[PDB]
Design an enzyme around this catalytic site. Structure first.
Site, PDB file in Angstrom:
ATOM      1  N   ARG C 372     -11.726   3.007   6.289  1.00  0.00           N
ATOM      2  CA  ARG C 372     -10.377   2.739   6.317  1.00  0.00           C
ATOM      3  C   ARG C 372      -9.962   1.486   5.982  1.00  0.00           C
ATOM      4  NH1 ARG C 372      -7.401   7.322  10.017  1.00  0.00           N
ATOM      5  NH2 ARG C 372      -9.254   8.648  10.237  1.00  0.00           N
TER       6      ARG C 372
HETATM    7  N1  LIG Z   1      -3.742   7.817  -2.055  1.00  0.00           N
HETATM    8  C1  LIG Z   1      -5.051   7.584  -1.454  1.00  0.00           C
HETATM    9  N2  LIG Z   1      -5.915   6.831  -2.565  1.00  0.00           N
HETATM   10  C2  LIG Z   1      -7.376   6.607  -1.985  1.00  0.00           C
HETATM   11  N3  LIG Z   1      -7.736   7.046  -0.848  1.00  0.00           N
HETATM   12  C3  LIG Z   1      -6.929   7.254   0.129  1.00  0.00           C
HETATM   13  C4  LIG Z   1      -5.667   7.809  -0.143  1.00  0.00           C
HETATM   14  N4  LIG Z   1      -4.913   8.268   0.812  1.00  0.00           N
HETATM   15  C5  LIG Z   1      -6.257   7.993   1.731  1.00  0.00           C
HETATM   16  N5  LIG Z   1      -7.496   7.567   1.354  1.00  0.00           N
HETATM   17  C6  LIG Z   1      -8.292   7.424   2.239  1.00  0.00           C
HETATM   18  O1  LIG Z   1      -8.497   8.204   3.239  1.00  0.00           O
HETATM   19  C7  LIG Z   1      -8.438   7.307   4.531  1.00  0.00           C
HETATM   20  C8  LIG Z   1      -7.535   7.808   5.706  1.00  0.00           C
HETATM   21  O2  LIG Z   1      -6.288   7.461   5.331  1.00  0.00           O
HETATM   22  P1  LIG Z   1      -5.348   6.961   6.685  1.00  0.00           P
HETATM   23  O3  LIG Z   1      -4.028   7.708   6.440  1.00  0.00           O
HETATM   24  O4  LIG Z   1      -5.536   5.588   6.909  1.00  0.00           O
HETATM   25  O5  LIG Z   1      -5.898   7.865   7.831  1.00  0.00           O
HETATM   26  P2  LIG Z   1      -5.124   9.160   8.645  1.00  0.00           P
HETATM   27  O6  LIG Z   1      -4.954   9.977   7.275  1.00  0.00           O
HETATM   28  O7  LIG Z   1      -5.919   9.828   9.584  1.00  0.00           O
HETATM   29  O8  LIG Z   1      -3.796   8.391   9.188  1.00  0.00           O
HETATM   30  C9  LIG Z   1      -7.979   5.882   4.075  1.00  0.00           C
HETATM   31  O9  LIG Z   1      -8.638   4.771   4.738  1.00  0.00           O
HETATM   32  C10 LIG Z   1      -8.473   5.825   2.514  1.00  0.00           C
HETATM   33  O10 LIG Z   1      -9.925   5.250   2.535  1.00  0.00           O
HETATM   34 MG   LIG Z   2      -3.516   6.970  10.845  1.00  0.00          MG
END
Ligand SMILES: Nc1ncnc2c1ncn2[C@@H]1O[C@H](COP(=O)(O)OP(=O)(O)O)[C@@H](O)[C@H]1O
Ligand SMILES: [Mg+2]
Ligand SMILES: Nc1ncnc2c1ncn2[C@@H]1O[C@H](COP(=O)(O)OP(=O)(O)OP(=O)(O)O)[C@@H](O)[C@H]1O
Ligand SMILES: Nc1ncnc2c1ncn2[C@@H]1O[C@H](COP(=O)(O)OP(=O)(O)OP(=O)(O)O)[C@@H](O)[C@H]1O
Ligand SMILES: [Mg+2]
Ligand SMILES: [Mg+2]
Lengths: 468, 334, 491, 46, 469
Positions: C372
């Site tokens: 993340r």
């Molecule tokens: N649009 C995207 N493009 C590339 N990687 C993504 C994208 N969205 C999420 N990710 C990957 O998935 C991980 C989880 O996203 P995040 O929203 O931070 O966690 P959560 O969905 O649990 O809140 C991110 O840290 C990233 O590495």
């Molecule tokens: Mg989150």
């Protein structure tokens, strides 16, 4: 006429008061932890009246160092937070204490965080598209201006990245006020958001209220109410359009369930509190747009263990006008945003509001993707050649559509190094109308991966040799 | 290199086993040496004097829990009114009042329905319509005042009436000028009951009839040539009004209540052997200074302490036991 | 044979030391005890979480406080507790000694040495439950913590101040990954620069003693113990130590983190902490939740893992990187504790047994694994070469499943097979960041497209060796400027 | 060779420990006497 | 008097009241009397909890049927102790240490309390040394560790006890040290059979047998392992002997603990197990260990309830082991013996640094082939191998031959099949499986690889089946 601590069990504290001085429900009481290493003032919210002049209370700060019999003082009112235009540009915690500038906002007007939802006669359904430039969102889950939007998903599927993307695509040019409630999430993410808003110059228009996952359950229960109180002041008093971002609303329910048994409540199914739906209903019904006063609220809803039948998200579903549902299966394929087009929904997705062409294209896309999901197993086992020529054509079309629903988002650059892109709604509708008609069947399916509009598609196909 | 490292590790381990063996033997023989040394009575006196000194240099500090708020306030009001009213009554009147209150308490215990329905002005009228003449005027007044307030639990009512009976008995003892005699007798009785846990447990079974255990105590401990009559009657009614509490606990509670009425506080001091009268006066003086109020001192003889004092009050102990120091030092050798 | 000074002089020093001043204090009494819990009446002034002194040197912690009594957890040697024993206030909440003397030492969750190497000189004491850094006391994670594992460093990069979860079934290489990460900090440690040094804490919870000894030997061989501390709560330890050890390790690491140092803390593993806490809560009769776990197990793990943070420059700029380990069951990540911890950390590395058996070692499941922090936790060269490696591999796995073809599809399958072969890496064989950059460059730029799949590994190896034999300026440039210059790219 | 070294070291260190145990018994009396003196807060002749 | 009295009786758990100041310490042994004719006996109770008010909750080591409230209870002042010394060898004991074959034997021996702390952490030395058994699957894929901890997991009737007997035959017979067998919650007739077999093979004189079997109260079932472990600990520490500790079945110890915990009034944990499941497991297991210079090679049979390897008991057992052989119902159904699950079994010494590069490479190739075979089982179950590619078809044939070849005619299996067992040298096993992975036996029939030893037996069976090697 002050009470004293009788029992301490984690975040729950029993307090005895003299007869006739029992605090009202939800009153904030003050106790003192005088131990040097942890000295502090505990705020306790009266949760229950136990009889015989005893009240059960939920601590907002950790109770380590608290001693039985210490004086407990009743403030006579519920937890109150500062309100007004002055909260814009600053970071607060669940109790209204400013974090970046300690002591700031102490003299502002203060509003109780407990509030009844608007009267039913003041409600008016909102049906007006909120364009975002995201192909999948704009096509299959059109957002509503002044409506309630959720991003459901399991852990680590892209909820937070999509919240940040929507802050970029909506709050940047938003004319009104923004309130971001970080509810029971990572402190690092809160700091990142604070810095990013400062860099984008959107902080001055935004009030941030943070109660992180390291906080005790009381803080995670009440931080959402504090942020909602600030947003409610902006909606009702200032008469301004408001953007309310909440991440993650499920932490409110989870914190409620953490203390449910310590409050003496028999557990419900799946270990949740018996009062799940009712507390959720109060909170969510406060988050609304009344007639002539707009709140566009976007909530991130955590789906535990990817189980969409879990009582928490299942109950939350009833409170939303648009739901973008992120899927672990789509995430693990590398499709981003990992939206499940077959599970997401929008109330303004119908010919009357979005127009005949948009509706027809979206329905055709959904039909194709549903058929592809039906044929997935057969393709995996018996291969592709056993399908009918029509079904082979549909499968190719569906794979290209699935890739094209992906997009290179701005907030995702940090994870891919590819700058984000924006796609107008008309371009999305035209492009997917062409896709469902088999226009781009000659291009490799890889050409459609993580791009924006049709010009990006042509450029990437050319980089792959194919000509659009 | 691994072999050399293992050799070093085992060498250090053997050194440490030798070190701990030396520590064990040294502490054991030092304990024996001090046990032999302390046999001299003047050594005990010197140790007591040293601990008393320490008590003087050690600087003072500013600093019935089972009862709840409602019960506590009701009991405080009732005891205050009793002190105001019954004080002028004559010793014979006090004895009659105490007997009547004890009878009332045992009756109330016999039928819990009345207590249940009464804990929650009509209460008084019920009392006269029930037992207006069965009890004296003062007894009826005290009982109506008792029912006047409310109680968190019905058991608090029987506890309150028992407390009133004990107060009446203590008042009659004070009028006779034998409060000290009854206090000492109660303390000795509690001591001997604690010494024989089997007897206390046997007396503590509320299942057995009260009369049988009362007769046991009378013809075993309470009834003897050198027993105060007031203490005898008080302990007898206490054991007869028992609700499962151990007899020694009840006796110590009675002694605590008596000293509280005297205005002092109890202080149980343990020592290897009895201390001189001057030592007693000095200890009382220092305790009164440290806690700021006069405190009665009760002496317990137990040679295991091997000198010093083990004062205890209010759930806090100031320990001077030589054995405690020995154990601490023994644990103080790594 | 013996210096005759410590053996004989220790008693003299001790006797000169036993002041044994008279103390006025509240004593409680044990009213019941058993299974590692004890109830104590009295102690009106005791604090919540206060440390309690039972006779015989046994320590407990006050957890439940009500009018009747105090429910406390015994921290070892619970068989010496008896009804009627005297309990003494300590006046302090749980705290542990902290300092630089703990490097290279094995201690128990109270900070006492168990390696049998003598007392530890403690710089100070630190309470176990001090608040974590706030939102305004942190800064963005921007320094790479190099694990030496190509898959992790290129696809789930870990920055300093990040919490990366190593989650998988038993015998999938979780401890291998964590120990290799610790060992990879040797080069940084030898530089002597506190901005580059990483001090490591390894918390072993509920592990068999001989396995902790195996880890300690693996660290000693690689010179890791010079900068590593081990906090051990083996399977025989009281449930109190198992519940407490991660907090002890976190406090030890926090002392360094707040003093401008960079810390890497490994918890092996939090599933056993959760088990111990559930045992304690059930013995204390607190109402249970899902899987009989207490309602506050998520809080237990969250407040622990939120103290791993990257501090702002005003606070010294130190960091503590967390590497919690979770052992899933039958590969189910839907269980209670795995879901909680996954939702807590800053990404996860999923280790699968099916991938491990296929030869994919480390058995990272690329599709579901994620960091993340992302590119922010990588040097420029690694970002450029490995910009879209994770999504490329996810697409490759999906297409491999589909294919059970078009020219483009065959090219994608070949490239993905080569990349998968590239990411394989033996144990105890770290790669410097420059070597990783070059290998990923080979994989992604297409220079392996002319090599047979089964040869890729060998090719990679040899080529790296070649660059070390000659043309070493490429590695030097990458290491110094943190980016591959187009001139260096051409060379 | 390491096994032989370990065995001979075991014997040598066992002899060393036995000799040290025999020798140390002279001074322990002073240690115990001083401990008794301290815990009694006054000099003790024995 | 300083004696107590029974106040409550709930199954094998008894509450005893003592006079204040005479409350026995935890784990003390107490004695009570049952006087009823048929069930007259002396109950041994173990103090388990202090309840307050001078009450102690105790676990009975014998059925409490016929016990009366109020009977006198005497405190022995010490925990349960068992005889120790070379005299225990060749004899059969119960949990309390009574000799069964020669009642009254060993009363004059030294007695050790069955409760003690595990060795100090600084005394622990990791053990990485292969104990060769002659079994192809064990030697190749899950090599056993000399002085380490070995477990044999399995459901009901998959061959745990037969494999324990096999390892007694292979390891204990040619053993110069002492062996301790702990029958825990297992068939009594199995104990009698083991006793008779050990006497027949002249191994009894070097073995000490401690039996607490199914028809025992849970207290005995959860303390018999401690008794046997105390005997083994005496042999390890007080005599410097190499020790073989065989336990069958440890899950029975865990399950008896669960029953006891239910009786004691503890709140149940997941799946109804005791809250202190991992902790009891840990104390018992960490007492079973090889210290520095003192070797215990322990082998434990672990029952898996309802074939559920996710069950908390085996799940918590897994962490205490150096080598793990997981028997599979699926493998058992195919007739493959031993019914080892090659993809689930593991060993901590199966790494190139310890077993060499050749052993490691061959084992990893076998595991890769078997894993690829397991991945195809979905397609094969519906369509068979005919739909697989040529590479997959070849791998499937190779994997089927490999899985047949991992079976072996065991020494202890002669009583069932009537065929003598075989031993396979480690080098021969490595070479044969290397050839199998390369494909040098792809032409022989599958049945040629079933229940044989080395390559000579493979050639002979192929000849009998009409093929040639
Ligand atoms: N649009 C995207 N493009 C590339 N990687 C993504 C994208 N969205 C999420 N990710 C990957 O998935 C991980 C989880 O996203 P995040 O929203 O931070 O966690 P959560 O969905 O649990 O809140 C991110 O840290 C990233 O590495
Ligand atoms: Mg989150
Ligand atoms: N990259 C690798 N290459 C080869 N072997 C490896 C690799 N990583 C780990 N192993 C081996 O895999 C086996 C399991 O590794 P490890 O003990 O680290 O796993 P784990 O998940 O921590 O296991 P457990 O649940 O037993 O603690 C060990 O033999 C280890 O040597
Ligand atoms: N190697 C073998 N050869 C032939 N038959 C075997 C073999 N191993 C086991 N069996 C058969 O399987 C039966 C079960 O064996 P065993 O009693 O050892 O299993 P187990 O797992 O210990 O069983 P339980 O759960 O009943 O204790 C044996 O009686 C025999 O019938
Ligand atoms: Mg591990
Ligand atoms: Mg069996």
């Amino acid at each position: 006429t002050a009470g004293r601590v009788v029992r301490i069990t984690g975040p729950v504290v029993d307090v005895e008061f003299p007869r006739g001085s029992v605090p009202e429900l939800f009153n904030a009481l003050h106790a003192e932890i005088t131990f040097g290493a942890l000295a502090k003032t505990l705020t306790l919210e009266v949760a229950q009246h136990l009889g015989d002049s005893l009240v059960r209370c939920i601590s907002m700060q950790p109770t380590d160092g608290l001693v039985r019999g210490v004086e407990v003082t009743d403030t006579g009112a519920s937890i109150s937070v500062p309100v007004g235009d002055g909260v814009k540009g600053h970071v607060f915690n669940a109790l209204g204490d400013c974090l970046d500038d300690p002591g700031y906002g102490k003299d502002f007007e203060h509003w109780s965080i407990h509030r009844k939802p608007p009267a039913f006669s003041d409600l008016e359904p909102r049906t007006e598209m909120l364009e975002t430039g995201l192909k999948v969102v704009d096509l299959l889950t059109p957002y509503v201006r002044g409506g309630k939007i959720a991003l459901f998903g399991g852990a680590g599927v892209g909820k937070t990245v999509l919240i940040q993307e929507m802050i970029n695509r909506i709050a940047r040019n938003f004319g009104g006020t923004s309130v971001f409630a970080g509810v029971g999430e990572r402190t690092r993410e809160g700091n990142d958001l604070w810095v990013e808003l400062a860099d984008a110059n959107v902080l001055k228009d935004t009030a941030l209220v943070f109660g992180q996952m390291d906080e005790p359950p009381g803080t995670r229960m009440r931080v959402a109410l504090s942020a909602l109180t600030m947003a409610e002041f902006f909606r009702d008093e200032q008469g301004q359009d408001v953007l309310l971002f909440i991440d993650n609303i499920f932490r409110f329910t989870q914190a409620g369930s953490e203390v449910s048994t310590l409050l003496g409540r028999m557990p419900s199914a799946v270990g949740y509190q018996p009062t799940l739906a009712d507390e959720m209903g109060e909170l969510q019904e406060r988050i609304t747009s009344t007639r002539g006063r707009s709140i566009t609220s976007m909530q991130a809803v955590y789906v535990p263990a990817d189980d969409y039948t879990d009582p928490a998200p299942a109950t939350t579903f009833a409170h939303l006008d648009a739901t973008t549902e992120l899927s672990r299966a789509v995430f693990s394929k590398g499709i981003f945003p990992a939206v499940d087009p077959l599970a997401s929904s929008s109330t303004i997705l119908d010919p009357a509001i979005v127009g005949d062409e948009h509706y027809r294209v979206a329905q055709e896309v959904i039909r194709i993707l549903q058929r592809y999901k039906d044929l997935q197993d057969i393709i995996a086992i018996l291969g592709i050649d056993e399908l009918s020529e029509e079904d082979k054509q549909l499968v190719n079309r569906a794979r290209r559509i699935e890739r094209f629903l992906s997009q290179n988002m701005m907030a995702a650059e940090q994870f891919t190094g590819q700058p984000g892109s924006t796609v107008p709604l008309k371009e999305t509708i035209e492009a997917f109308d062409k896709l469902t008609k088999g226009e781009f069947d000659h291009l490799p399916e890889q050409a459609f991966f993580l791009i924006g509009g049709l010009d990006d598609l042509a450029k990437k196909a050319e980089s792959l040799g194919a000509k659009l | 290199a691994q072999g050399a490292q293992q050799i070093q590790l085992m060498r250090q381990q053997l050194i440490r086993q030798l070190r701990t063996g030396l520590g064990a033997e040294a502490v054991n023989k030092a304990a024996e040496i001090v046990r032999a040394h302390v046999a001299d009575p003047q050594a005990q006196s010197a140790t007591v004097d040293r601990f008393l000194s320490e008590l003087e240099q050690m600087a003072p500090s500013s600093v019935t829990s089972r009862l709840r708020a409602a019960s506590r306030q009701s009991l405080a009001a009732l005891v205050e009114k009793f002190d105001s009213v019954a004080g002028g009554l004559d010793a014979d009147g006090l004895t009659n009042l105490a007997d009547e209150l004890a009878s009332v308490a045992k009756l109330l215990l016999s039928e819990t329905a009345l207590n249940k329905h009464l804990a929650e002005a009509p209460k008084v009228r019920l009392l006269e319509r029930l037992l207006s003449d069965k009890v004296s005027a003062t007894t009826l007044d005290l009982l109506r005042t008792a029912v006047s307030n409310r109680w968190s639990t019905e058991s608090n009512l029987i506890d309150a009436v028992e407390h009133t009976a004990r107060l009446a008995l203590l008042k009659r003892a004070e009028i006779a000028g034998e409060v000290d005699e009854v206090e000492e007798q109660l303390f000795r009785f509690g001591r001997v009951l604690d010494a024989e846990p089997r007897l206390s447990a046997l007396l503590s079974d509320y299942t057995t009839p009260a009369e049988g255990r009362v007769a046991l105590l009378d013809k075993a401990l309470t009834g003897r040539p050198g027993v105060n009559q007031t203490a005898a009657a008080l302990l007898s009614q206490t054991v007869g009004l028992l609700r499962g509490e151990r007899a020694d606990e009840a006796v110590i509670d009675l002694a605590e209540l008596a000293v509280s009425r005297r205005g002092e506080v109890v202080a149980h001091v343990s020592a290897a052997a009895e201390l001189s009268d001057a030592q007693r006066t000095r200890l009382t003086e220092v305790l009164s200074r440290i806690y700021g109020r006069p405190v009665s001192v009760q002496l317990h003889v137990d040679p295991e302490l091997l000198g010093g004092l083990s004062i205890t009050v209010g759930d806090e102990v100031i320990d001077g036991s030589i054995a405690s120091r020995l154990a601490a030092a023994q644990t103080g050798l790594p | 044979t013996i210096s005759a000074a410590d053996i004989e002089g220790a008693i003299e020093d001790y006797v000169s030391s036993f002041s044994a001043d008279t103390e006025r204090e509240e004593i409680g009494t044990v009213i019941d005890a058993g299974d590692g819990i004890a109830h104590v009446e009295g102690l009106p002034s005791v604090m919540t979480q206060e440390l309690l002194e039972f006779p015989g040197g046994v320590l407990g912690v006050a957890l439940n406080l009500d009018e009747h009594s105090v429910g406390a957890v015994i921290l070892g040697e619970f068989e010496k507790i008896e009804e009627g024993q005297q309990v003494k206030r300590t006046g302090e909440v749980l705290s542990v000694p902290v300092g630089d003397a703990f490097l290279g030492r094995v201690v128990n969750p109270l900070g006492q040495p168990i390696d049998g190497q003598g007392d530890i000189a403690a710089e100070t004491r630190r309470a176990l439950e001090l608040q974590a850094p706030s939102v305004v006391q942190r800064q963005s994670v921007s320094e790479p913590l190099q694990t030496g594992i190509k898959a992790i460093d290129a696809m789930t990069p870990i920055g300093r101040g990040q919490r990366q979860l190593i989650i998988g079934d038993r015998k999938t290489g979780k401890t291998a990954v964590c120990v290799d990460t610790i060992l990879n900090q040797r080069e940084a440690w030898l530089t002597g620069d506190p901005k580059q040094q990483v001090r490591c804490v390894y918390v072993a919870i509920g592990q068999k003693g001989t396995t902790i000894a195996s880890v300690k030997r693996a660290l000693e061989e690689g010179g890791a113990m010079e900068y590593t501390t081990i906090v051990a709560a083996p399977a025989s330890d009281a449930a109190g130590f198992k519940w407490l050890a991660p907090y002890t390790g976190s406090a030890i690491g926090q002392h360094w983190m707040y003093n401008g140092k960079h810390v890497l803390i490994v918890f092996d593993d939090l599933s056993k902490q959760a088990d111990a806490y559930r045992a304690i809560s059930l013995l204390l009769r607190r109402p249970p939740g899902r899987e009989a776990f207490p309602g506050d197990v998520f809080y237990l793990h969250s407040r622990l893992l939120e103290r791993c943070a990257k501090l702002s420059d005003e606070l010294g700029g130190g960091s503590m990187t967390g590497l919690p380990i979770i052992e899933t069951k039958a590969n189910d990540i839907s269980a209670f504790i795995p879901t909680n911890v996954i939702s807590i950390t800053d990404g996860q590395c999923f280790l699968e047994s099916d991938l491990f058996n296929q030869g994919v070692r480390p058995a990272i499941n690329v599709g579901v694994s994620v960091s993340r922090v992302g590119g922010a936790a990588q040097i420029k060269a690694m970002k450029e070469v490995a910009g879209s490696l994770r999504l490329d591999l996810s697409q490759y796995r999906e297409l491999e499943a589909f294919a059970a073809l078009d020219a483009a599809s065959k090219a994608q399958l070949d490239r993905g097979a080569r990349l998968v072969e590239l990411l394989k890496q033996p144990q105890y064989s770290p790669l410097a960041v420059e070597e990783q950059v070059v290998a990923i460059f080979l994989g992604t730029q297409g220079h392996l497209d002319s090599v047979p799949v089964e040869d890729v590994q060998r090719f990679e190896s040899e080529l790296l060796e070649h660059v070390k034999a000659s043309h070493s300026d490429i590695f030097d440039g990458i290491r110094e400027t943190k980016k591959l210059s187009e001139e260096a790219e051409e060379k | 060779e390491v096994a032989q070294t370990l065995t001979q070291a075991d014997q040598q260190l066992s002899a060393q420990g036995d000799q040290v145990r025999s020798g140390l018994e002279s001074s322990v009396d002073g240690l115990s006497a001083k401990l008794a003196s301290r815990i009694l807060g006054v000099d003790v002749n024995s």
